[PDB]
UniProtKB/Swiss-Prot annotation, chains A, B, D:
Outcome after substituting residue 144 to D: In Cerulean; leads to improved quantum yield, a higher extinction coefficient and is 2.5-fold brighter than ECFP
Use case: Green fluorescent protein has been engineered to produce a vast number of variously colored mutants, fusion proteins, and biosensors. Further generation of mutants led to more stable proteins (at 37 degrees Celsius for example) with brighter fluorescence and longer fluorescence lifetimes.
Outcome when changing residue 159 to A: In GFPB; leads to enhanced fluorescence at 37 degrees Celsius
Effect of residue 101 to T: In EBFP1.2; shifts the excitation and emission spectra to shorter wavelengths and increases quantum yields compared to BFP
Family classification: Belongs to the GFP family.
Phenotypic consequence of residue 141 to C: In mut1.9; shifts fluorescence lifetime from 3.03 to 2.74 ns
Tissue expression as described in the entry: Photocytes.
Impact reported for residue 142 to I: In ECFP; leads to cyan fluorescence, folds faster and more efficiently at 37 degrees Celsius and has superior solubility and brightness
Protein name, entry field: Green fluorescent protein
Result after altering residue 38 to N: In EBFP1.2; shifts the excitation and emission spectra to shorter wavelengths and increases quantum yields compared to BFP
Impact when changing residue 220 to R: In Azurite; shifts the excitation and emission spectra to shorter wavelengths and increases quantum yields compared to BFP
Gene name, Swiss-Prot/TrEMBL: GFP
Protein's organism: Aequorea victoria (Water jellyfish)
Effect of residue 68 to A: Increases fluorescence at warmer temperatures such as 37 degrees Celsius. In GFPmut 3; highly fluorescent mutant when excited at 488 nm
């Protein structure tokens, strides 16, 4: 696609989140860069309002799948870049099993030369000492496959997957993601055949950072089509 | 599951289909056996009303995913076998791009020792000389991945894939499958995490058979989960 | 250029002369292949009487040129690149806690037919073992066939390990060491590392009176996205 | 395996390399940690002798496959952890196409609680303004599959793969890796069936490091077996 050309090199990224979980208001800013040639992303996030009231891992998926590596034989199936530079709206409900849910709406688009992800997040019905508000999640992250299907009737894609968040007692907290992506612009976009993105995420801390924060490095690669 | 135990050996299969496509009524009977240990099916189908009014390949998916091979590490994700012996209802709409659609409802269940797939099919809005009613599909079949997700609210699964049917002129006719499976019985079933079935289908003819018929050999293997 | 020979259905002939612990036998096979789908259909007949080893032990010996190589991997298809002049395929197959087969085969076009002519020598088999004692089930598992280039022979090296189910619930392993080299002087494609995913269905012809095997196989290359 | 248990948590790593390429002697020290539960490694390398006389990316493979994530269903095929704590010897020849070769011998083993990788490297027959000694490789890295087979006679494994190093002019420099691993100790080890490791590597710099260095984050995951 035309938008594919915008991602041949390193692109700067900004992320802004305004959040409210069970009435706890918070904001996070992020910055870094993506190199879609390698499916690779490097981002740092800071909670600018103080302590983050939910665990950092629960927000990883909310905080730019346009940075995925699509191998040459799958490039006709990259919706995310074809929607650029005008961007796409990304909407999710994330259901935490036996707990509350997040609803998010984000615009992912170029603003100048920067790829910007602006998100609003509302969480409701969380248990006050559940795994989320009780900060019982480990600071780590599993590998996941993100399943993508076209929704031609709605001019976009539907995406589903279930994050496994490791809990400090050895169990797992499931987070079932229902996601829709829709172009913002008027121009032609690619609607893909069914496939998935293999995603690996490394969480870490910046030793020179005293605020509440997360450093994220991710690899994302499309797979599953040989026709 | 308990249903899994019913599939450790060779199981006889019966298939019955009552069809109506654009008013053309027809019936097909099939028989054979399945060996889920190898994910392998062998089936022969006969049009008992005379000439089949649609191409045989368009009906392959309609004519028993309980015969899939689920590797040991994925056995908790096998909805199909978990619903047995009481069975499941399988409903599809199959949209042939630039042409009509099939709507199917089937019961797949044990009747004595035999796995039986009983189907009603209604096709509408087909073009009198499109690829289907004009018999322009080649007598072959491509390999496909069948994408499976849980549908917890319906105590079953939602399934999607798009068959690529080769046309005699070198082009491809797509057939977009929207599928749902729901248990017939009240007992618990296994609701899976997202995965897919890799399916390979070989079509042939019985040299001793003078009626309009199709011989099908299929391999079906679950994949995509390592957690 | 060899690719072009496989765009449609290609008739196949297989001929094998075997000697296992001195038991001499011959098998003739025929059918066809459609590499567009990676699909083979073959029927084999023991023309000397009863086959003295189980039919499943010979499946891999009885035309990987019929593999489906998806478009993005077409530069890695050695097998077709060697056609029509063909390739030599040699193996040693070690049956764990039992004897071994050694095979040498030529796979090439003879007219418009793809022909696999094999010599097989088996030695040191136990008369009461899984092979000569016919304790293998008439079935077959799915396997990955691992391929590497052998630049100094201008061919490939191939390795994999067949799991043959035994009639008591155990498994008999057959470790395959394989080498393929071009017969002709023409250029071939030396591949990057990859594998072939293979599935095999064994059956019987209900009217065939001779000792025989009907085989349907699907073979698809995978592992490369660069 | 017993050695598997040593990797259930975060394990500190030390790396030491003495090298000679075309007579250019250098030393590199590295340190960090590995978390095999996630197949994750974080390492920083410093050239303690001054400037590195070869490009950093050519040494990535030389600088602890015991940190691979083996999924539960493949754990009997993890030779690398089975050889711990006594360790293994890893030997390679790396043939850079149209250029010279590296030959390496390393011991990878526990010294107390730390996993240490100690390497000697000799490089010969490099061209003076080839891609290597001419420093024409880009500071990036592609994803690779690492192919493993058992070597029963050596009580270890034989490993082969070909690294694709991107060049500054758009081309690729190949580096064909012939590798052998053998146990240092005499205790039992796990000899695997054929499989591979999917590997992803992110190269970066420490903004406050003035010495010639490389920061490496890697993910490694075993695949290819379902039996």
């Amino acid at each position: 696609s035309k938008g594919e050309e915008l991602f041949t090199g390193v692109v700067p990224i900004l992320v802004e989140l305004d959040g409210d979980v069970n009435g706890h208001k918070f904001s996070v800013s992020g910055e870094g860069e993506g190199d879609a040639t390698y499916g690779k992303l490097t981002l740092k996030f800071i909670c600018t309002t103080g302590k983050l009231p939910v665990p950092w891992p629960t927000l990883v998926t909310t905080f730019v799948q346009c940075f995925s590596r699509y191998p040459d034989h799958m490039k006709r199936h990259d919706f995310f870049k074809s929607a650029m530079p005008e961007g796409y709206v990304q909407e999710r409900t994330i259901f935490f099993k036996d707990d509350g849910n997040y609803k998010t709406r984000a615009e992912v688009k170029f603003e100048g030369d920067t790829l910007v992800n602006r998100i609003e997040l509302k969480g409701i019905d969380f248990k006050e000492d559940g795994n989320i508000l009780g900060h019982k999640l480990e600071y780590n992250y599993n590998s996941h496959n993100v399943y993508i299907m076209a929704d031609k009737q709605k001019n976009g894609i539907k995406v589903n997957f279930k994050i496994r968040h490791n809990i400090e007692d050895g169990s797992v907290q499931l987070a079932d993601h229902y996601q829709q992506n829709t172009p913002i612009g008027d121009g032609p976009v690619l609607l893909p055949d069914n496939h998935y993105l293999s995603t690996q995420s490394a969480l870490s801390k910046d030793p020179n950072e005293k605020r509440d924060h997360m450093v994220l490095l991710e690899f994302v690669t499309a797979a599953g089509i040989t026709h």
